[PDB]
Design a protein around this ligand. Structure first.
Ligand SMILES: [Zn+2]
Ligand SMILES: [Zn+2]
Ligand SMILES: [Zn+2]
Lengths: 236, 220
């Protein structure tokens, strides 16, 4: 397996950031990549083994270290907004071609001028269209999260307490509304019969990752740290 | 080793992955007291059942078979700069570390008190730096002294960094009592591997800690 830590991170320009990769595949090769919307997966640094690292295709602005076989770290001494991106780690057996690689879950890193912009989301649940119910035989619930920044969020659905992916349709990526505000919507379709049973519970769960304990927030104002907001509704 | 000429020194600005040299001298060296060979792969090496953070076995390639069979059954002290990439110790197993030389006899090679050796550092033709190195061995390998010189220089003068170097060229010169002096270039060739570079310690050159001088020459 390959894990990455932290999975979410907001940093201020000029700050120092460290992404850590851990593997249990006992592979000699490890890699650090970055991916940017519409753009490709680019290699930053890689390593053929403990105690050494190699410059990738876009090394400028990053340092790397391989303290052991299991770990591979990517260091950003002076974070810049241009380093905002989604970082991927991977281990590789054999020669290290893609077919022999195993990627991590990814890390979302956002670098801004200051943290006073970070804001938790607004979550709302909406009942199926009046008409849609009748000659639709299908009931569709729409979940909307907005006014959040940056865009490190996860949206899931829970019917009767059990997570569901069937009938779900979530926007592939959070879309920006204003300069400092994102929006994200999703839909859950069920049989109009299911939506009419007062025994059925509907829940839209949203998780927002903001600032961390390690971060220092200007005292006097509530610190926008991670949050778990949920909108619910019963069957009518 | 006849002293070097400017054109004979490797330039750091030409080394693409110079951080791989930094890792060797910034990190802890592999040190082991009174231990003896357990296995052997090639005629000129010895394997030990010693351990460290990243290894359960250590291999040391010496100058040749004669020297290998000389230390094979003795109780030695190990002090070297190890690498892990390309350190094949068998067909299947691993968790092995590799070095070159760094071997001395343990029995009766220690000092009541550590012997301090002065390192005269010269930067741009001007010997303006001087600091002390230490060892508790009578007969010490050049490697040990070298590692200690570079570790201090890296920690205090930034000889190496996880990146480029403030110095363009550099080398360490050893001046034994009644023997020919020799030197090591601080920088590798544009393309190198840790194992290839570390061959400077394969000869297991040892010195009399009591009567040996150390000079360092750098250019920014
Ligand atoms: Zn999360
Ligand atoms: Zn000893
Ligand atoms: Zn050369």
């Amino acid at each position: 397996a390959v894990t990455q830590s932290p999975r979410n991170k907001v940093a201020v320009t000029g700050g120092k950031v460290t992404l850590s990769c851990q593997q249990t595949n006992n592979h000699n090769n490890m890699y650090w990549y970055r991916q940017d919307t519409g753009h490709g997966l680019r290699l930053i640094h890689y390593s053929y083994g403990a105690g050494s690292t190699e410059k990738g295709d876009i090394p400028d602005g990053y340092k790397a270290s391989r303290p052991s076989q299991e770990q591979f770290s990517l260091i950003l001494e002076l974070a810049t907004p241009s380093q905002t991106s989604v970082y991927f780690c991977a281990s590789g057996g054999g020669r290290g071609s893609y077919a022999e690689q195993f990627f991590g879950p990814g890390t979302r890193l956002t670098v801004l001028e200051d943290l006073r912009q970070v804001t938790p989301p607004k979550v709302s649940l909406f009942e199926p269209s009046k008409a849609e119910i009748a000659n639709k035989q299908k009931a569709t619930l729409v979940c909307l999260a907005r006014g959040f920044f940056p865009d490190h969020v996860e949206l899931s659905w829970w019917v009767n307490g059990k997570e569901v992916h069937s009938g779900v349709s979530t926007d592939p990526q959070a879309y920006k509304e204003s300069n400092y505000s994102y929006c994200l919507s999703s839909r859950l379709r069920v049989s109009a019969t299911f939506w009419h049973n007062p025994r059925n519970h509907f829940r839209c769960q949203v998780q927002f990752h903001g600032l961390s304990e390690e971060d220092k927030w200007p005292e006097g104002s509530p610190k926008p740290v991670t949050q778990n907001i949920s909108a619910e509704a019963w069957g009518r | 080793q006849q002293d070097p000429d400017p054109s004979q020194l490797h330039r750091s600005s030409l080394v693409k992955n110079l951080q791989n040299i930094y890792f060797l001298y910034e990190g802890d060296p592999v040190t082991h007291e009174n231990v003896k060979s357990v296995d052997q792969l090639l005629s000129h090496d010895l394997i030990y059942n010693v351990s460290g953070p990243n290894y359960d076995k250590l291999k040391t390639e010496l100058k040749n078979q004669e020297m290998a069979t000389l230390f094979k059954d003795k109780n030695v002290d190990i002090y070297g700069v190890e690498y892990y990439h390309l350190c094949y110790l068998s067909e299947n197993a691993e968790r092995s570390a590799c070095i070159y030389g760094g071997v001395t006899n343990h029995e009766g090679n220690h000092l009541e008190i550590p012997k301090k050796i002065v390192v005269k550092v010269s930067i741009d033709g001007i010997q303006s730096l001087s600091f002390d190195i230490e060892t508790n061995k009578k007969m010490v390998t050049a490697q040990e002294l070298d590692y200690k010189v570079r570790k201090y220089l890296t920690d205090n003068k930034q000889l190496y960094t996880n990146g480029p170097s403030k110095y363009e060229t550099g080398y360490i010169k050893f001046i034994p009592k009644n023997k020919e002096s020799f030197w090591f270039d601080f920088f590798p060739e544009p393309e190198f591997t840790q194992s290839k570079y570390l061959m400077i310690y394969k000869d297991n050159e040892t010195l009399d800690s009591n009567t040996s001088q150390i000079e360092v020459y750098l250019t920014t």
